[PDB]
Amino acid sequence: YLGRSGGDIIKKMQTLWDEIM
C-alpha cells in the first residue's frame, strides 16, 4: 500500500532473524 509497503515489510522481517540468529 503506497509504493510497495506490504511486500517489502515481510521480506525485511524474514532476513532480520535469518542473518542475526
Q: Distance between alpha carbon 3 and the CA centroid of its chain, in Å?
A: 14
Q: How many CA atoms lie within 13 A of 8 on its CB side?
A: 5
How big is the chain, counted in residues?
A: 21
User: For residue 19, what is its C-alpha cell?
Assistant: 542473518
Cell of 21: 540468529
7 three-class SS: helix
**Beta-carbon contacts of residue 2 (< 8 Å; ≥ 6 apart):** none
What does the DSSP 8-state code read for residue 3? S
Largest Cα–Cα distance in the chain? 31
How far the first Cα of the chain sits from its last, in Å, is 30
The number of angstroms, rounded, from the C-alpha of 20 to the middle of its chain's C-alpha atoms is 14
Which cell numbers in the block locate residue 12? 525485511
Q: Exposed, middle or buried: residue 11 (CB in 10 Å: 0-12, 13-18, 19+)?
A: exposed
